[PDB]
């Protein structure tokens, strides 16, 4: 009943009034900067370091795959293209859903419980257009950027695997074949997925913090509801997206 239609109607409503309205710009730009810093800039290490390992794994693990077929040159073509088509926009989506897909609902849900939101709503400044929106636009412009940083560092780690650990390919790895890998349509397809995942994550990462029953046991269960839906729907939309993006 509740989640049947009421919860989702409320979740759509709380957004349909969260962006479209007065086009006020020079007011939110300072807020947008700090939301970007907290959500995106601070979370850098959550995808820098974690970009390394998931790269190096796909390196070392992928290494012992085509080495069985002795095609060690295709490494980047199998490494990069992999973490550039699927593993980027999903692993750096789950690491995001952690560092900023959770901390948000545990930051804006906290407001609704410490009553910063109702007090804002008490001044004529609307809480949605002034607190939801700067966070929302920090998310949907940091996540796809985060994914690019993630893929770059993952490629670098895969290099350190396929180069430093095994001095096997220097330019023959990337400078030779990744030319046939770095094409535009690929980054296009990755960025579309990253944008849709930003939308979804930092939407439900911010509908809970607004729909959270305001108590110290409400925001904590809501953070869990975020890291649950922000992987359920993340993978679901990844499946549907890759279906409609490659099953042609």
């Amino acid at each position: 009943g509740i989640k049947t239609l009421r919860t989702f109607g409320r979740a759509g409503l709380m957004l349909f009034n969260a962006l479209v309205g007065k086009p006020e710009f020079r007011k939110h730009a300072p807020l947008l900067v700090r939301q970007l810093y907290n959500v995106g800039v601070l979370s850098m290490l959550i995808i820098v370091v974690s970009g390394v390992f998931i790269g190096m794994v796909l390196g070392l693990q992928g290494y012992l795959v085509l080495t069985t077929y002795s095609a060690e040159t295709s490494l980047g073509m199998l490494v990069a293209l992999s973490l550039l088509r699927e593993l980027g926009p999903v692993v750096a989506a789950l690491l995001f859903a952690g560092r900023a897909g959770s901390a948000l609902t545990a930051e804006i849900g906290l407001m609704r419980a410490t009553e910063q939101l109702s007090s804002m709503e008490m001044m004529a400044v609307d809480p949605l257009r002034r607190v939801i929106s700067p966070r929302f636009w920090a998310g949907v412009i940091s996540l796809p950027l985060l994914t690019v940083i993630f893929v770059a560092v993952g490629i670098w780690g895969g290099s350190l695997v396929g180069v430093s650990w095994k001095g096997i390919d220097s330019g023959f790895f990337w400078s030779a074949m990744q030319n046939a890998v770095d094409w535009r349509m690929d980054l296009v397809n990755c960025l579309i997925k990253s944008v849709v995942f930003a939308i979804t994550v930092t939407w439900i990462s911010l509908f809970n913090g607004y729909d959270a029953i305001p108590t110290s046991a409400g925001i904590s269960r809501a953070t869990t509801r975020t890291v649950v839906h922000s992987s359920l729907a993340v993978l679901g939309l990844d499946f549907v997206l890759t279906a409609l993006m490659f099953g042609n």
Binding site: T114, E121, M123
Partner: protein
């Protein structure tokens, strides 16, 4: 108009547990009224109601004439410029420090020059008292200084109706007294008409000029603090001093107490 806000006859249901019922209240201008009742009876809901942030089921709440519900949802913001809740727990913005945490409604509404706004905020801080605490973060202040700075920022715009959601709640008598003196000196200095919804009677009635008392689903008594102190009414006489047992049960309802000890007596 004699009063500042008339809550004529409000019944609010909140789903399946009807909170209010045909309740009647009249906050007059200049008078620092109060409303008190059982804890968690939902009086904070009554406050958030007078702020429009929630609508009544069937009732006419008239802030200074027009109805709060009959508002443009932006005209509502226009008039809400003439209000300020003072929530407990401060409700300071965790991000910006107190100085900025006070300035917020100014920068939001006035076109104030920067060095002008700085001094006005540095002045309201001394007013409430925590002037030296401009640089400090809200997560750093105490639980009392939090409410005090929240008050300071709440008086900005001179709201002419600044309601207090149980401010002296969980507060030692020194901070309790600082609070009960601040929000008294304000009404005795500004034209503010505070509406203190609370339940710390020996503190509220010290300054409350016209109090209301509500039982579980309606208001039972009102009047002056002195004319209320002498009320011979069970539901009221109970709360007014905590006789701990009367028309409000001290013992939760249960069955027969006998087989409870003797399952299969």
């Amino acid at each position: 108009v004699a009063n500042l806000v008339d809550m004529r006859d409000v019944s609010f249901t909140r789903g399946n547990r009807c909170i209010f019922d045909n309740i009647s209240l009249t906050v007059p201008r200049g008078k620092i009224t109060a409303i008190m009742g059982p804890s968690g009876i939902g009086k904070t809901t009554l406050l958030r109601l007078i702020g429009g942030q929630i609508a009544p089921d069937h009732g006419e709440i008239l802030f200074d004439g027009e109805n709060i519900p009959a508002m443009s949802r932006s005209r509502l913001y226009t008039v809400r410029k003439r209000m300020s809740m003072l929530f407990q727990s401060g409700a300071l913005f965790t991000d910006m420090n107190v100085f900025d945490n006070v300035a917020y409604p100014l920068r939001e509404h006035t076109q104030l020059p920067a060095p002008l706004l700085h001094s006005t905020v540095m002045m309201k801080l001394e007013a409430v008292g925590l002037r030296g605490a401009a640089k400090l973060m809200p997560s750093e202040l105490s639980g009392g200084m939090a409410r005090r700075a929240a008050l300071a920022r709440a008086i900005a715009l001179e709201p002419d109706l600044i309601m207090f959601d149980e401010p002296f709640v969980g507060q030692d008598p020194i901070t309790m007294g600082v609070l009960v003196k601040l929000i008294s000196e304000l009404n005795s200095a500004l034209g503010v008409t505070c509406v203190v919804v609370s339940h710390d009677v020996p503190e509220v009635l010290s300054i409350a000029d016209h109090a209301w008392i509500l039982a579980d689903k309606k208001i039972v008594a009102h009047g002056s603090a002195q004319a209320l102190q002498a009320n011979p009414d069970p539901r009221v006489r109970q709360f007014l001093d905590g006789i701990a047992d009367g028309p409000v049960p001290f013992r939760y309802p249960a069955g027969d107490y006998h087989a409870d000890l003797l399952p299969g007596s």
